[PDB]
Amino acid sequence: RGLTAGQQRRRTIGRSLALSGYVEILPTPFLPAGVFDLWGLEADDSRRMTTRVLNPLEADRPQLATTLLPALLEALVRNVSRGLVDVALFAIAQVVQPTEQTRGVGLIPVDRRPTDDEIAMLDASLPRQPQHVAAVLAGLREPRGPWGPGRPVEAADAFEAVRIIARASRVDVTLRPAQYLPWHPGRCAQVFVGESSVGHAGQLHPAVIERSGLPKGTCAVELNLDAIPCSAPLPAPRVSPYPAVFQDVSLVVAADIPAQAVADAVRAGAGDLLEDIALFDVFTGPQIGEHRKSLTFALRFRAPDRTLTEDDASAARDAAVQSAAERVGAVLRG
Amino acid sequence: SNAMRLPYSWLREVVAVGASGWDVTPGELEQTLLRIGHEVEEVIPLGPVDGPVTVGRVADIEELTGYKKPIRACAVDIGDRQYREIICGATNFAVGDLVVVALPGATLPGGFTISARKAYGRNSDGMICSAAELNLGADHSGILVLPPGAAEPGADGAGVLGLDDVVFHLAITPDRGYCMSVRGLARELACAYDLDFVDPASNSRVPPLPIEGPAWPLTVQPETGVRRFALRPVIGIDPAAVSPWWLQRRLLLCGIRATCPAVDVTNYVMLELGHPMHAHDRNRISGTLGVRFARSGETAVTLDGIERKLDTADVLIVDDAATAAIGGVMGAASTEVRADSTDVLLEAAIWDPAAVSRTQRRLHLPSEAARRYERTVDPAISVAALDRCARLLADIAGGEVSPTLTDWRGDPPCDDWSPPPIRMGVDVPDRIAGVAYPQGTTARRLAQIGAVVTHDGDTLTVTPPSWRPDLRQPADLVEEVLRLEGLEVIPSVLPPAPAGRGLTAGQQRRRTIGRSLALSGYVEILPTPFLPAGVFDLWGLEADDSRRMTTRVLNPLEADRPQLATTLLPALLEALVRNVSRGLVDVALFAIAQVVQPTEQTRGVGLIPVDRRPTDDEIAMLDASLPRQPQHVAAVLAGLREPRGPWGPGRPVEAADAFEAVRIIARASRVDVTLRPAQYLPWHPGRCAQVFVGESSVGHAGQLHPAVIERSGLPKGTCAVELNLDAIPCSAPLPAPRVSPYPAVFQDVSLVVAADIPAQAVADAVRAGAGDLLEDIALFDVFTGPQIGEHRKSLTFALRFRAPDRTLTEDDASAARDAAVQSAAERVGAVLRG
Amino acid sequence: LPSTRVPAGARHPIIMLAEHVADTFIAMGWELAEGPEVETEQFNFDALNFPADHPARGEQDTFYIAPEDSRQLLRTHTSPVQIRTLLARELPVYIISIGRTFRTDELDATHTPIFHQVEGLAVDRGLSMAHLRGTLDAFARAEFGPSARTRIRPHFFPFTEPSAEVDVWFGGAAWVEWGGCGMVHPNVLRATGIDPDLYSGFAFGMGLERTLQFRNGIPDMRDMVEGDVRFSLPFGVGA
Amino acid sequence: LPSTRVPAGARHPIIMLAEHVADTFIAMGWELAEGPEVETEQFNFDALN
RNA sequence: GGCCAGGUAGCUCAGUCGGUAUGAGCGUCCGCCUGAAAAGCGGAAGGUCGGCGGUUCGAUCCCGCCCCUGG
Ligand SMILES: Nc1nc2ccccc2[nH]1
Ligand SMILES: [Mg+2]
Ligand SMILES: [Mg+2]
Ligand SMILES: [Mg+2]
Ligand SMILES: [Mg+2]
Ligand SMILES: [Mg+2]
């Protein structure tokens, strides 16, 4: 039957990240010496519940990897410390997450096949070990050249890695602001597929960066590929031969309102005539209230069976404006 | 054509002769016909009608004048003592004609309820129905007129018209010409249902008429391929006679129009037995009838009144004065039956299938006789079909069958029309089917379809019947057994495939290129292989441009687009215009497909005998006669290449985006390319690169010529790239890097060169002079201020030096940099920036 | 905030379907062959047991290459690849071929003149209709899910005997014609230097545009080939 | 002139080699399995004689 | 193949049987407006009316041939 759906996904994710300027590494499963103490993690952090090794190669690194970030951040330090300061590394490997103290299973006689109840008893005594994808970035995200001086890595580059992985997985993700070490609480996004949390992304906490010797502004991503369901959609597009109508709408919202939330509300209200919507302007200033912002979206309307009048499109736009007012408190820019 | 239309009642009748009481629902019949290999295109039930739909007779007609159309007020006898007044707009009937009347309260097909309406100032108590309104036939110009004697006024319309019937529209495969008749289809159903079959063409159903002498002098040239030619006359037919309704109805339900008893009988026997028949007016035949090839330039007027230009390979029927027929295609107007024809000579002939197929196709005459002859007609039933015609016509038209008969059966006369026997193992159908059939299955099924089966131990000797010329090899007999037992009993078993090698390197390369372009913002399209009309004229190509040496198509769907694509760009540009013209103005399209580039004028290779393997010389000869078909990748770009967003207004497409597409394809192919300025239409001569892999040129890229853009209706600044993937060698490098643990040295060098000097040339010269110590080089500044001379530019490269076994000093790296500067000075004329 | 500064791209769904079909057969040990679109009449008709001056070759309309009677044409199917494979490769042969095919049909919502076909050819010792049916059922399960049911019914093709058509059952749920199949005609094996008493074989051919039409419920087939980005983009980047 | 604004990326050769090995065996009809790295001694030693 | 009926702006179409298609809706452009947009109001541009010839002082319109669609 060839490759499973999941195995095909890991290939597409690896191909897409490499084509986007990421270099793959092989992550080591041995955690650095007190790496979580460097991150400032709480004593009750679920990542601290690790599986330990009796005889490690180094007596100060006997813990197994709950997250792929310590191995990627270690490989990032090697590259930066050797002159390669503009790096972006990723890794697709499984982790180790025990749900209890290391429990053992008694010896089952080899002269026979273990029953399916004995098999399930052996699986439960093992850590969960899901497949993860992670990435770290530092230095210049866009190299300099004749075009200009290049762009340093920022949190949005980590969010774009999420959208690169999500497009490779053929799923839609939603990002919500969140606090989760070792990320910067104001530059961190929790990633959601539907209603299931699948990981985090963004810039790393500055204290974590200084205490780890990492480059300033280091960003990071980590997703749980096993929490992302496999999807094989079967789209049935129907290309309308009728002309479209182009319109723009400017909406004012509180600063904390995510731009995607406004886009979703406009889409939910505009109905089936809305063919495309893109945000192209984020404006602040005294013309707009304090701690508020104006967002302008480009809208494309098209009917499948007729040419639209401008009033047809404006009706769909007003319904979208009303939906944004009810969902994110948007006010039409006046 | 291969359509076969017939009503179920007729098909059921022929089956029921041997299987009394046989009757199946239309749904089951459709499934059984499908399960044995007969495509059922349509199942059309007649009607239905409800309420008072009855036979009437037009007893009076009053012409209502002064309207937009002639309107008739008719008195119609419906069988009671009160004649009904009905208004009708049709003019195809007269007083005394039998018609079909739908009275108020009736419901015609389509849910139309009939009621009495005050129309044209008169009272209308119903309507006179056409065949279309009754769902009996397609005619709607006039109303339906039943032939005299069809029924009496007051008879139930649904019964007289047989509206309970169901018409089956079949599509018959060209290997089953015997199924273009009720005879063949009924025999097939007898096989499928394990029924006893009574052949409607057997002597028990068509008893032979007397044979007391020749019917007409006949000369046959056997080189025409004629297998049989029979003639029998019918004298004293009544010109006032008309075919009975049961005959005209069965013709109508089979898609044939009635005309006169002589022609109706020939068409009816054609549908019933599968043997085409034709009626000649014998009183219009002059002298001996001759069957011969046509001569060069000979013409003939068919019975439709059209003169036909004939060919030396067309078979004709001629007499001493004129051509009588185009053999097996259509009869001529000279001997056609007319309204005053009283003496008829019926023709039953078997023509060469290939000769008829060639003639009817060249003449555009796919007549009911032609499509049957080209699929072979049973030569054993020629006299049976002839006698069936003569007796039916004499009965219907009040004539008398003449006891004379001419029956040419070849020279020397052929007495047995059976194909050659076939030897086959008794279990051969079992082996090919993968099914253990019960003992005797093969012999039973082959005897069912009409073959003679003799047993010689384990080997069967099978002689197929004369109406099955498709049964020539054991595989043909296997299909008969398998289809009659049903393909549903064959199990599903996976074959023993061996270990494969997977995808070729070229197949994997196309996947990687398509994946990389799509991930880089390109949308894939399927390029049409047909070039648009005069596209190379729009490009302004020279008349001797190799792209114009195309391959043309004789019969294209668009006469203005016959040539095949020597380049993928015209198809991509057409798709680009479609997108932009519909509101999608920022677009990047790509396509991976083959082109057709001939190296000589179209040279055809003769027919090689297909009974043996063609020699390796013949295989290489057939390949050289075909144009070259290399694999190309191409792309086109217009509008915004970077969309606008909160970051800024976006970036319009420029030539460097096309050069970047080259580099994406190159990285996907694991090869290095070099770009050099070039002039090559339809590109902009100052913004066009030629792509090289090593020393071999693989294509071009850049912005398109502005004059080409204007003439082609393209967006301004449209860019394009095309590469020949077959010209790029497949590469599988094996790098063995050794990471140096020692620190690097960072230095930048600013070199002033002439503006025409390519930056990659300055970079290659710096690499050549620096040596192994150079780990990386990146251009990051191009400066053209008046501090630099006119037509000159300053280039600053970032250099990274590293040794594999030591730490370098600044002097160590400056030594390599100075050697790189000297190398740039010698190779591209570089001057160190002052 | 939006972070994708790259325009949305997509591979064509027909190319993705061909790639999934190719993967399906390679996973079973089969290989993928090639073939030119402009083919000689010898390989498109004569070697495939097409009778001369017969409706089997006449009723099938063909794009012919100028001049007239040039024995050159645009291939009416990927079946000539069977001839090229059996002449060039050693036995046994288990091959599929995906390429463009040319018919003289008017482009509408369900017909296209230029479409893509999947040809299959297996030649080995002891191959039967059961092996053809097993291959067809595995093919239909890969494209239409595990609950896919097929049926074969007799038909005619000059290059096969017995010949059949394949229907699929994945209206809302009924028998829809998928493609043609059958045992390789012994004349085709003799025209390639293969002993029909030693080797048997089967072949099949499905249209990719037709397959995608009811696998996804796509209304207008004109959108499949016209190249509007609105048709490709919803399918995603595709690997 | 340089046209690639995207920095150089690469997949690891070992992953590339594993992909090439996997493709070679899929083409022969084989499939790809799964296995935890933290394993019980029952499956790593005891059940393997 | 048959006489019809369609081919008209970037898209979907209406309309003209000789000198303006006062073409529509949407698409493009300009002004007011906005930080920049859109809507709104006010305005513009753009068709060689399928192609090639003929008739005519002049052809989207009349004639011939041809290409592309539906019956
Ligand atoms: N294209 C195609 N290929 C075939 C192979 C076997 C039977 C019928 C077929 N139609
Ligand atoms: Mg047969
Ligand atoms: Mg138009
Ligand atoms: Mg404006
Ligand atoms: Mg305006
Ligand atoms: Mg105007």
Author numbering:
A (entry chain E): 498 to 831
B (entry chain B): -2 to 831
C (entry chain A): 99 to 268, 273 to 341
D (entry chain D): 99 to 147
Text lifted from the article:
AaRSs catalyze the attachment of the correct amino acid to its cognate tRNA which then is used in protein synthesis on ribosomes. Phylogenetically phenylalanyl-tRNA synthetase (PheRS), belongs to the class II aaRSs, and it is a dimer of heterodimers (αβ)2, containing two α- (PheS) and two β- (PheT) subunits. Structural studies of PheRS have shown that the α subunit binds L-Phe and ATP and is responsible for esterification catalysis. At the same time, the β subunit is involved in the recognition of the cognate tRNA molecule and editing of mis-charged tRNA.
The protein-fragment interactions were analyzed using crystal structures for five of those fragments complexed with MtPheRS/tRNAPhe (DDD00107555 (D-555), DDD01008876 (D-876), DDD00805735 (D-735), DDD00079004 (D-004) and DDD00067116 (D-116)). All five fragments occupy the L-Phe site in the α subunit of the heterotetramer. The bicyclic quinoline, quinazoline and benzimidazole moieties of the fragments are completely enclosed in the L-Phe binding site. PIEDA showed that the phenyl ring or the bicyclic core of the fragments interact with residues αPhe255 and αPhe257 through hydrophobic interaction. Residues αThr258 and αAla305 make hydrophobic interactions with the phenyl core of the fragments D-116, D-004 and D-735. In addition, a strong hydrogen bond between NH2 of D-116 and αGln215 is observed and, a proton of the protonated N of the benzoimidazole core interacts with αGlu217 through salt bridge interaction. Hydrophobic interactions with αAla305 are retained in fragments D-735, D-004 and D-116. Interestingly, 10 % DMSO increased L-Phe adenylation in the presence of the very hydrophobic D-116 fragment.
